[PDB]
Structure 1
Amino acid sequence: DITVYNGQHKEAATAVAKAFEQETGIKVTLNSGKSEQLAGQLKEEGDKTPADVFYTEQTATFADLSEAGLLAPISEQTIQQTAQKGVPLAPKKDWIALSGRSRVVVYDHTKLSEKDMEKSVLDYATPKWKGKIGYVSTSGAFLEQVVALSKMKGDKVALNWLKGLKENGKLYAKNSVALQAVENGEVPAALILNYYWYNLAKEKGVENLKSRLYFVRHQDPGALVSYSGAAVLKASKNQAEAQKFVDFLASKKGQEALVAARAEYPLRADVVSPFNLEPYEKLEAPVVSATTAQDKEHAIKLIEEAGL
């Protein structure tokens, strides 16, 4: 039986954990928490941790754990299962990316069309969009978006974007509220995460929604994908079962269980989402280094300096 420290959404974790038990007979116990809290706890526990596997919504928490020497190598065969072009790869082969979530632009298709849309996320934070673009400054995904912009285009561009959103954007408390405002006719478009919209569409039928999705693509900062993944703890006294769980997550069946429970992009090339997501490769996600905590603190300074 194994212990999984779980930073991912509980419906995702529960659903892969149950398909695991069904396929192998091995019981999974989840210890859930925020990924950053869990990584800290895994570093304090060190070689005395009870964790066998760390399952996270964000692969960036792996870099420090790897560098601290706390992750076990994963099979090369397993790593190759999700190693599409653009997918982050552990240089020490000691964690694996499993699924992604994308930034998108949701729009009311009865007020705007694909041809009104912009080639860059940078273009939405300008006067042509005054009163017409929703954003959510308090979101974890928003913070990540800032970091990527800072890294790809430098700090002056990121700050200019944030100032533009302040001047021109409609601020919403959460991604789901932003979507509702677009559906309700309050704002014709917003910046959100893909899965809020696919969830609504799965539930309602696309033909009954005013809103549609525009993906920026061509490796723009607004095509940013954030990746979930897993690692085996080097200190686990149950390596065999831990490695079997991680291989299962990379397997066709494990990936099929994830995408049944949650509208993330599978990273296996032979699995299709029941939410009707495009193939990962069509996203043309940019290549961006991992978000450190210093990166997150930096983005918060830019958000503050912008009056947000």
Structure 2
Amino acid sequence: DITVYNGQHKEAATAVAKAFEQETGIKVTLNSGKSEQLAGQLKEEGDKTPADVFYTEQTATFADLSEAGLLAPISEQTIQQTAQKGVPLAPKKDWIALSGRSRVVVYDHTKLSEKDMEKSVLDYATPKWKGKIGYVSTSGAFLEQVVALSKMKGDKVALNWLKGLKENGKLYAKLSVALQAVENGEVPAALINNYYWYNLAKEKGVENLKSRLYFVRHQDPGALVSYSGAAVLKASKNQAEAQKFVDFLASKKGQEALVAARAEYPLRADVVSPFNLEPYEKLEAPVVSATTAQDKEHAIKLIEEAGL
């Protein structure tokens, strides 16, 4: 039996855990919380951690554990199972990217078509979208987007975009609220994450939705994907079962379990999502270095400078 510190969505972790125990007979105990909290706990606990695996929504959280010497090597053959072009790789081969979530533009297709959409996410922060583009400055993926813009285009472009949103955008408190505002006709478009639309479409039926998605693609900053993943703790005294769980997460069956529970893009090529997601490779996501705490702090300051 193993203990998994879980930063991923609980329903998703519960589903992959249940599929693991059904396939192997090895029981999984989840200890859930926020990834950066669990990461900090794993560093404090050090060689006395009870954690066998760290399962996360954000592979950026692994960098600090890796450089603190806290993560175990995993099999190169497992890592290759999800190593599509564009997928982040652990340089020390001590964690694995498993699935992703994408930034996207949702839009009311009864008011707009793909003709009205922009080539770059940068262009939505312009006077043509005055009063007409929703955004959610508070979510974690919004912060990652700012970090991505700074790294790919510099602080001046990132700040200009934030200022553009302040002036031209409509602020919503949560992503679900932005999505509903497009559906209900309050605003013709919003910047959101993919799974919100795919979840709504699964429950209500796409035929009953006014909104559709537009992916910028072309390695645009707006094509940003955030990656979920897993690591084995070096301090684990049950390496065989821990490695077995991570191998399972990268297997056809483990990926199937994940993609049914949550509308993340699988990173195995031979797995198809029931949420009707396009293949990861078609997103054409940019390659971006992992977010550090310092990147966050810098981005937070940009958001404040822009007036939010």
Q: TM-score normalised to the size of structure 2? A: 1.00
1:194 to partner: Cα distance: 0.1
Return the alpha-carbon distance in structure 2 between the equivalents of residues 302 and 205 of structure 1. 39
- The Cα offsets for residues 157-188 of structure 1, whole Å up to 9 and x where unpaired, read as 00000000000000000110000000000000
Deviation digits for residues 174-213 of structure 1 (CA, Å, limit 9, x no counterpart)? 1100000000000000000000000000111111100000
**Aligned counterparts of 2:52 and 2:293: Cα–Cα separation in 1:** 24
- Looking at structure 2, the residues matched to 2 and 294 of structure 1 have their Cα atoms a distance apart, in angstroms, of 33
Q: CA deviation at 1:25?
A: 0.2
Superposed CA deviations along residues 264-283 of structure 1, whole A, max 9, x for unmatched, are 00000000000000000000
Deviation for aligned residue 1:250: 0.1
Give the Å deviation of 1:134: 0.1
| Equivalent residues in 2 for 1:11-90, closer than 5 Å | 11-90=11-90
Which aligned pairs between 1:93-132 and structure 2 lie closer than 5 A? Answer: 93-132=93-132
Measured against aligned partners, the alpha-carbon deviations of 1:207-246 in whole angstroms (never above 9, x if no partner) come to: 1100000000000000000000000000100000000000
Q: Which residue of 2 aligns with 1:279?
A: 279
Q: C-alpha displacement at 1:292, in angstroms?
A: 0.4
Structure 2 distance, partners of 1:264, 1:102, is: 8
Distance 1:202 1:33 in 2: 27
Deviations 1:6-29 (A, max 9, x none): 000001100000000000000000
Q: Distance in 2 between matches of 1:177 and 1:94?
A: 38
Partners of 2:30 and 2:61 lie apart in 1 by 18
> Partner of 1:170 in structure 2?
170
Deviation string 1:62-106 (CA, Å, 9 cap, x unpaired) is 011000111000001100000000000001000000000000000
* Per-residue deviation, residues 113-135 of structure 1 (Å, max 9, x unmatched): 00110000000001000011000
Structure 1 residue runs of 5 or longer lacking an equivalent are none
Partner of 2:218: 218
> Which ranges of 4 or more aligned residues in structure 1 deviate by more than 2 Å?
none
Q: 1-side partners of 2:94 and 2:292: how far apart?
A: 18
Identical positions, percent? 99
Structure 1 CA distance, aligned partners of 2:250 and 2:209? 34
Question: Which whole-Å CA distance do the structure 2 matches of 1:120 and 1:146 have between them?
Answer: 14
Query: How many angstroms apart in 1 are the aligned matches of 2:258 and 2:174?
Result: 24
| SS of structure 2 residue aligned to 1:60 | helix
Distance 1:11 1:286 in 2: 28
Q: What displacement does 1:111 show?
A: 0.2
Query: 1:44-79 CA deviation, whole Å, 9 max, x = no partner?
Result: 111110000000000001011000111000001100
SS of 1:5's equivalent? strand
Q: CA deviation at 1:303?
A: 0.2
SS of aligned partner of 2:59: coil
Count of residues in Structure 1 that have an aligned counterpart in Structure 2: 308
> Secondary structure at the residue paired with 1:212?
strand
State the Cα RMSD in Å. Answer: 0.4
Q: State how far apart, in whole Å, the 2-side matches of 1:265 and 1:116 are.
A: 26
Report the equivalent of 1:157.
Answer: 157
Q: TM-score, normalised by structure 1?
A: 1.00
Counterpart-to-counterpart distance in 1, 2:275 and 2:108: 20
Bigger mean CA offset, 267-276 vs 202-211: 202-211
Separation of aligned partners in 1, 2:206 and 2:217: 22
Query: Counterparts of 1:212 and 1:134 in 2: how far apart (Å)?
Result: 14
Aligned residue for 2:253, secondary structure, equals helix
* 2: CA distance, partners of 1:139 / 1:60: 16
SS of the equivalent of 2:62 reads helix
Partner Cα distance (1:173, 1:15) in 2: 29
Question: 1:300 Cα deviation (Å)?
Answer: 0.4
Q: SS of the counterpart of 1:106?
A: strand
**CA distance in structure 1 between the aligned counterparts of 2:46 and 2:7, rounded to whole angstroms:** 18
> SS at 1:128's partner residue?
helix
Deviations 1:133-160 (A, max 9, x none): 0000001110000000000000000000
Please give the secondary structure, in 2, of the residue aligned with 1:247. Answer: helix
Q: Distance in 2 between matches of 1:279 and 1:212?
A: 17
